Write a protein that binds this ligand. Sequence first.
Ligand SMILES: *Cc1ccc(S(=O)(=O)N2CCN(C)CC2)cc1
Ligand SMILES: *Cc1ccc(S(=O)(=O)N2CCN(C)CC2)cc1
Ligand SMILES: [Cl-]
Ligand SMILES: [Cl-]
Lengths: 228, 228, 8, 8
Amino acid sequence: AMGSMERASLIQKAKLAEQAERYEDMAAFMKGAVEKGEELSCEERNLLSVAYKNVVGGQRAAWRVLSSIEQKSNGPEVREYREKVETELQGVCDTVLGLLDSHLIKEAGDAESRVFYLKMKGDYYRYLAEVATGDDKKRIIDSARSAYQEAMDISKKEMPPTNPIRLGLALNFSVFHYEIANSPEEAISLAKTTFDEAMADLHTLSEDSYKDSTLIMQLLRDNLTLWT
Amino acid sequence: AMGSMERASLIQKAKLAEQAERYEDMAAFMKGAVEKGEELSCEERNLLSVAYKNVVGGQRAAWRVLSSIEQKSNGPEVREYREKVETELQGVCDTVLGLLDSHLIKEAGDAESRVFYLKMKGDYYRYLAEVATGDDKKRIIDSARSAYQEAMDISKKEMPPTNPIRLGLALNFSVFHYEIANSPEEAISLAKTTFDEAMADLHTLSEDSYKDSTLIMQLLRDNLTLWT
Amino acid sequence: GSIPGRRS
Amino acid sequence: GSIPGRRS
Ligand SMILES: *Cc1ccc(S(=O)(=O)N2CCN(C)CC2)cc1
Ligand SMILES: *Cc1ccc(S(=O)(=O)N2CCN(C)CC2)cc1
Ligand SMILES: [Cl-]
Ligand SMILES: [Cl-]
């Protein structure tokens, strides 16, 4: 618990931890900062997101290595170790989801913060769904879908089609459709419509905003190239 | 503590952890395997060494990032966080040194195992010396020197000049001289003599041994190029 | 690929 | 550079 460290110090240390590539530390500092109870600024939300995407990204890559070895194998060691990594990953996803539920989402009133947190909620339920096999796997998938859908509804009402958070949300929801929901046609249609509506709005942007939006558009096009 | 897991299972999981790039896990499994009390085979020594070099390698890279930021800075946060990473690094080095002292070195009777463990002992005292500033920094440097020197004496009596452990020991002792002991001339002379005596022994080797030895010779030449 | 999201 | 020593 980071309860004895100042909020501003936790934020400063999270930035240092990023520079040092100490992502577990970075996540613990940002968890501490959230638990101070104040809303997060745009920059602080990004730090929270980057910390946990790196932590869970390493766990997911490890889980995929071990899952592949285990599939080829079919002693208990490979399964046991895959299970250990899986439980650790589930614990990190549950931690992030807990921060969003207590109480980041309910205090997020602006569209930019609310969309950001709901996209996170969809992503972390998606990572749970990647490893799920039991009685609640359908419910996990629906929890991801519901979070992404609420984020999409807000983003289409409140943000321009080139907004980078709106674009990244659509990208990740399209990956959800393709990889989790077994809806490749929905994934392709979402990615295409998102790309085209962004293209048509680029003329409104400054040079710096243009760079930000076109970077994510390229990720949409990369997926469309792979899927079609 | 890994006391309830079988030795063979710990070894198997250390190999899986390597494939999954889970080096902290890998180190904990290999620590558990050492604590079973049996000597380690050549392969098991390599697993132990690779696990801890990755763990301490990440800590050292982080410490250098933070130390550099702290030097440029001269709030307490940068120093505090550098100190936290430093203490963690010191704890890992102390853990490795403890395994070597209890009881890997004393049970190592063959030259190949004894040289391997003494080289490790020099390396981990060297990593302690990289961060040391207090009353015992000279003693830490001398502990590294003494371990490397005993390893060198055994290796010159018992191994051919192309033996990869002998070569890597000489490489790392030359780095100790250059970077820690402020003896660049000793570092250059050790690297040159090691390279030349290895060159003269390559004719005795099979194609596979030739590849193993020449790879480390290239690291010696790379340092000589940088130092001269 | 999803958003890498690994660098601030 | 010392021995990388990072891969078995
Ligand atoms: C989900 C998502 C992650 C990252 C981006 S971004 O890389 O465009 N960018 C991160 C930095 N902040 C300040 C702006 C957004 C977009 C979507
Ligand atoms: C200190 C040191 C580390 C690694 C080597 S090596 O890469 O040549 N090699 C590692 C694998 N084992 C089986 C042989 C040695 C040499 C020195
Ligand atoms: Cl609010
Ligand atoms: Cl023995």
